[PDB]
Design a protein around this ligand. Structure first.
Ligand code: K
Length: 199
């Protein structure tokens, strides 16, 4: 490896490390607003005089607790990715330290780690995409029961849900950026082990 290739690899590891930190911070912010919204849903549900409005709010309250638990799963997934990323860094380091003394075992380990990270991010994207769909569905339902009795708290609940959706789309974009970095690391990886094919 040239200094330029080592630096290219190290820059991608650092960018990805910073991205996973940004993802963990955004999940923490999502958990905070979503727990605040659970309390708003419970309050609105307790106050609701119209049985059809109580019914809608109560059944969404049950789904909300499940969505909170999924976000905590995403925190653990992001942590596992951070651990795999350090192991990928160590495998990259093996490639430039050993250079021509490297063997296929280095490439195999590197590709196994990069594929595990890719699989974690694909699972991550699917779970965020699904939660986003469920948020969009609840908003379409919530819109039908605005005004009349509960009007004020239901409008505040809708404003909250619209902010939640903005943050979940922001989180999807970060996971999509992470999948770009996996491909760049695989491209830089190939440059690190390429010489081993032609000895
Ligand atoms: K060799």
């Amino acid at each position: 490896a040239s200094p330029e290739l080592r630096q290219e690899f190290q820059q991608l590891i650092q960018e990805f490390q910073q991205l996973l930190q940004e993802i963990q911070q955004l999940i923490r912010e999502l958990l905070k607003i979503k727990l605040q919204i659970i309390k708003q849903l419970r309050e609105a549900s307790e106050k609701a005089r119209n049985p059809e409005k109580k019914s809608v709010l109560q059944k969404q309250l049950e789904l909300e607790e499940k969505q909170i638990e999924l976000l905590e799963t995403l925190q653990q997934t992001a942590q596992e990715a951070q651990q795999l990323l350090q192991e990928l860094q160590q495998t990259g380091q093996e490639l430039w330290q050993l250079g021509g003394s490297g063997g296929p075992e280095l490439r195999q380990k590197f590709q196994q780690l990069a594929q595990k990270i890719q699989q974690l991010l694909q699972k991550f994207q699917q779970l965020v995409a699904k939660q986003l769909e469920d948020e969009e569905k609840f908003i379409e339902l919530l819109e039908t029961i605005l005004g009349g009795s509960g009007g004020d708290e239901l409008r505040e609940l809708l404003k909250g849900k619209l902010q939640v959706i903005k943050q979940q789309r922001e989180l999807l974009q970060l996971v999509q950026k992470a999948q770009q970095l996996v491909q760049k690391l695989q491209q830089t990886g190939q440059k690190l082990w390429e010489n081993l094919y032609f000895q």
